[PDB]
Design a protein around this ligand. Sequence first.
Ligand SMILES: CCCNC(=O)CN[C@@H](C(=O)N1CC[C@H]1C(=O)NCc1ccc(C(=N)N)cc1)C1CCCCC1
Ligand SMILES: *[C@@H]1O[C@H](CO)[C@@H](O)[C@H](O)[C@H]1NC(C)=O
Ligand code: NA
Ligand code: NA
Lengths: 249, 27, 10
Amino acid sequence: IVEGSDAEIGMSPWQVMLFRKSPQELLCGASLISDRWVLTAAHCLLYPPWDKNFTENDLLVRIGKHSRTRYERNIEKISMLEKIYIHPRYNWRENLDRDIALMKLKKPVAFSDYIHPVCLPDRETAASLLQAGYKGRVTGWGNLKETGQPSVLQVVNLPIVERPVCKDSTRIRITDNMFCAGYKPDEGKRGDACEGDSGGPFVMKSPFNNRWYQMGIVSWGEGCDRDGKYGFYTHVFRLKKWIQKVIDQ
Amino acid sequence: ADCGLRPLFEKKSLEDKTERELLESYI
Amino acid sequence: DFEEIPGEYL
Ligand SMILES: CCCNC(=O)CN[C@@H](C(=O)N1CC[C@H]1C(=O)NCc1ccc(C(=N)N)cc1)C1CCCCC1
Ligand SMILES: *[C@@H]1O[C@H](CO)[C@@H](O)[C@H](O)[C@H]1NC(C)=O
Ligand code: NA
Ligand code: NA
């Protein structure tokens, strides 16, 4: 996260760290959606241009974390993966269209003050919140700058941007399965997701029922926090039918 | 269920430092 | 720079 702030304790209890076993390093962000299911970006697990193809045994999910590097004894819970499910129409060749994956945990995670699932939006939640100007929140342990690493989870609040402005900021083809967010150069305010934040959640707090909903997944960008450029997010509601199908089994 | 309600915030009726910024944007 | 995690997590 570039131009963000340190998160408060228990501020994002659905925040998951995808952790590589060997070498011991941060793989990606992710989110807790139930006691057994974790949501992330497909590119965190499968990305042939960079020879990325992680299997279940290659990683661990670390839930309830705040500190990036420390082992948070009695706070964080470390879970093993049973199975990874990548969207069958995930487009890694061109624009990361349908950049979504699910991970089933071997055992259910016990909820605590620091571990709690986020909601997934329904059609009405998405129609009412996914509006240009409405702000969401992005969290992660990724880079503090494009060109370094935070000690604790970082947070940034960012406005959803009009689809024509997203389209006009890039030469990449934008699909209906994506949305973009961030401030314009005229807005003065800064902020963006960056490398290592991928797979993390873009959340919004419903003013109707006061619940947090995951509207997006940190997907891609061209650099980090560049003027005239915006962060791109996987549109969670547009891919809910696939999510439901995988979970129903 | 109790999804999206944080034990240290909504469950206690405590607000985090920037959640009002989100609410103010929902015009 | 990552602190070692308990052996039980492989
Ligand atoms: C980390 C900044 C330097 N790297 C990039 O800008 C990588 N850009 C690619 C990209 O972002 N990705 C390929 C894997 C994925 C990735 O690197 N995601 C990390 C990332 C997350 C958030 C942002 C952001 N909101 N600025 C930028 C990169 C896109 C290029 C245009 C076509 C789609 C892909
Ligand atoms: C990724 O890894 C698996 C081995 O687990 C292999 O079957 C698969 O074809 C690899 N590549 C892609 C692009 O899926
Ligand atoms: Na364009
Ligand atoms: Na920007």
